């Protein structure tokens, strides 16, 4: 996913003290975890170039003239409710892009991003970001305790 | 990573999915020296008389006749009569290349923004059916086309235009559950070498009797559950599913008749809503005159229904994906004109054969819970509800080029 | 493959709690143990058909 | 709630109470306003919707 | 005679529109032709009256990929009819307008 | 007894609590606790097509 190194292992070390020995599924997981609501996941979209034209993006922009033919004679016209009658005649489809098979469109790029829920994310002020104590290890430290800080 | 040709992310289609699968597009078909053309001519341009000088006029495009765009809405099952009107849509002319297919799958890359098709000029293509021979009833703005139909491989096919599509099967290509076979382990030929510098001796001996596979899968399954999907080291259980391996055939839940209706809801069972006038009466002697501004569409008798059986349909699409199409060769045929490729175990071989009816239907081993005695030699974790190679194929993309 | 990389990570034990357990574990009776959770050995032995 | 869930005859081409129309296409004369009939042609067109 | 439907795509078809294509923002819909609307955009007769754009989210849409629509996660999940809880806290009251707690 | 401040959230922190002392799974309708939460496969769904 789009989840780095540096941030994937300060999650897990402030909510299971994991890091520093192998990541696994960890034994008893709450409500409000990481590991349970972090959900990665991918997809491949064309290049859209000059050969392929993204006749998506161009019904976004006009939808009262169609570029987009799939299932036609089977459903409404795509500018009016779905809910409605059959319309058209049975005909070939030009869209979306065959993605894998035979005919398969070379220059695919993919894309990657996660999604999580229920999660607030956490940075402890630790020293390893470890769960060493309620009352933390920089918590008792005389360097920030005794003194005044002005944190942005 | 490429995963070639045989990767096949879904079931079913994704180019006209709604259309039965025997159904043909607009097209022209070719037998001997006759051509034959079918049609479906939604619009209207009415045109009576000779439907010549109106044939001329409404010029054409690569989007102008829309396959979308057909008969207003609320026209009902409206008979368009062939005299004082005429017809007007698409059709795909001969001379192009690829092989004809049907409805059901049948895909044509775009070729600008506005969603044309055609690769050369557009034309016009005109038929009557009428007993006049004077008269144009459609025109048609013709197409050419390369012809791709991906994702469906011929169920049938009779020498040019009878022929029924099927999708193809689905196949899930990823790596493997915590990506064994990435890594040499038990290979004397190819070891790993961890060791200090000077490399006198390594610590890593690693012997041919022993499985480090199999001992990190055991120990994996002793430390944690085996349900929870770990992405980062790919940890998910190769499954199959209980009600499949082991179909539990206990019938369906009958009930009322699941009825289909006509949307129009008002017609004859044979004849469109007869159209009618009220009447107003007289009183203390019979006689009944027509009113003044009424117009009546009236339907008469019952309403016409068809009947589906939904739970016997519902469930013998269950027993066909899941159990029948994953039988052994043993009990599959390849259909009439086809040819496959010659080896067996390629993509090209499985996806072609097709198996026998009466194998599996929704009668066998009826109220029993008991797996096919012909299953049991049939690896059940090659299956498309193998739901941890379906995690592990979806956690990639969904092409066939991926940057892992 | 187009490149690959090895990650570790280096847990920031003090330098003097460190020296003490380094010590430690040079000695030759603190010697680090392990074992195959498998235990087995893997022997192949072919059917004919039928 | 969803979109229709419509049913249709596995033909797809068809007059809603009538087998489809048999006939001839052909082509015209070019600016005389005059369709004959052209050989070795034969079609079948539903005229309405499905 | 017989008709002919594909009946596992229409139980799917009917699953896509009915939760995705009918949670879409306020973007991706359109009031029909000849229908009024109340004002304010936050009322029931102005959610009520939109319907969505035809084919943004179809039986297609990203073919065999686990993948989310980029428009739906800005987009609150919880605000859906098929959270158990919400509809178990609503039926734990009774179905009518006026109700007695 | 009761300095009630701004800077606090007291029904955020019985939330947490209670999803540390028992299992959000249970629906315990006598304090109306019964959790917000949605379907698995309308956020983010798999497009597998049709059987």
């Known amino acids: 996913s789009n989840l780095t190194k540096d941030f994937f292992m300060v999650q897990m070390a402030a909510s299971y003290n994991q890091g520093y020995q192998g990541f696994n599924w960890p034994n008893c997981t709450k409500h409000y975890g990481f590991i349970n609501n972090f959900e990665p996941m991918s997809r491949q979209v064309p290049e859209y170039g000059a050969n392929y034209p993204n006749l998506m993006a161009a019904y976004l922009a006009n939808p009262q003239t169609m570029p987009i033919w799939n299932n036609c004679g089977f459903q409404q016209k795509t500018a009016t409710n779905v809910l409605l009658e059959r319309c058209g005649h049975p005909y070939v489809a030009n869209w979306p892009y065959p993605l894998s098979g035979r005919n398969a469109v070379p220059n695919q790029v993919t894309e990657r991003k996660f999604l999580v829920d229920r999660y607030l994310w956490q940075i402890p002020f630790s020293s390893n970001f470890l769960n060493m104590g309620t009352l933390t290890d920089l918590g008792q430290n005389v360097m920030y305790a005794n003194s005044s800080h002005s944190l942005n | ?404 | 493959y187009t490149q690959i990389n090895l990650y570790v990570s280096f847990f920031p034990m003090n330098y003097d709690t460190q020296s003490e357990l380094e010590l430690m574990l040079r000695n030759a009776t603190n010697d680090q143990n392990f074992s195959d959770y498998l235990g087995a050995v893997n022997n192949l032995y072919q059917i004919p058909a039928g």
């Open chain 2, 1 to 404: 990573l490429d995963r070639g040709p045989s990767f096949k992310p879904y079931g079913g289609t994704a180019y006209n999915p709604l259309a039965p699968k025997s159904a043909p597009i607009n097209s022209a078909f070719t037998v001997g020296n006759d051509t034959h053309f079918v049609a479906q001519l939604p619009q209207t341009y009415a045109a009576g008389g000779t439907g010549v000088t109106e044939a001329i006029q409404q010029q054409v495009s690569g989007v102008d006749p829309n396959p979308q765009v057909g008969q207003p809405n609320y026209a009902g099952p409206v008979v368009v009569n062939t005299t004082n009107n005429a017809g007007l849509g698409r059709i795909v002319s001969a001379d192009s290349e690829g092989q004809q297919f049907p409805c059901y799958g049948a895909y044509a890359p775009p070729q600008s923004a506005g969603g044309d098709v055609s690769t050369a000029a557009v034309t016009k293509t005109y038929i009557n059916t009428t007993n006049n021979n004077g008269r144009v009833s459609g025109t048609m703005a013709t197409d050419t086309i390369t012809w791709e139909n991906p994702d469906a491989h011929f169920a049938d096919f009779v020498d040019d235009r009878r022929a029924t599509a099927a999708g193809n099967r689905p196949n899930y290509i990823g790596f493997r559950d915590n990506f064994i076979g990435m890594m040499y382990y038990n290979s004397g030929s190819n070891t790993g070498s961890f060791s200090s510098q000077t490399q006198q001796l390594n610590i890593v001996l690693d012997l041919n009797d022993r499985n480090s596979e199999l001992s990190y899968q055991y120990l994996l399954a002793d430390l944690t559950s085996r349900w929870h999907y770990f992405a980062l080291w790919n940890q998910a259980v190769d499954d199959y599913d209980h009600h499949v391996r082991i179909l539990e055939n206990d019938g369906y839940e009958e009930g009322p008749p699941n009825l289909a209706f006509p949307p129009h809801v008002i017609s004859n069972p044979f004849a469109p809503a007869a159209v009618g006038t009220g009447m107003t009466v007289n009183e203390q002697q019979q006689t009944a005159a027509v009113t003044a501004n009424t117009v009546a569409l009236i339907g008469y008798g019952n309403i016409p229904a068809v009947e589906m059986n939904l739970p016997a349909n519902l469930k013998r699409t269950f027993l066909y994906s899941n159990v029948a199409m994953y039988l052994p060769d043993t009990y599959k045929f390849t259909p009439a004109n086809v040819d496959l490729p010659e080896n067996h175990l390629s993509y090209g071989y499985i996806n072609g054969r097709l198996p026998l009816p009466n194998i599996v239907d929704t009668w066998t081993d009826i109220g029993a819970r008991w797996s096919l005695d012909v299953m049991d030699t049939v690896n059940p974790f090659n299956h498309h509800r193998n739901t941890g190679l379906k995690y592990r194929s979806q956690l990639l993309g969904n092409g066939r080029y991926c940057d892992f």
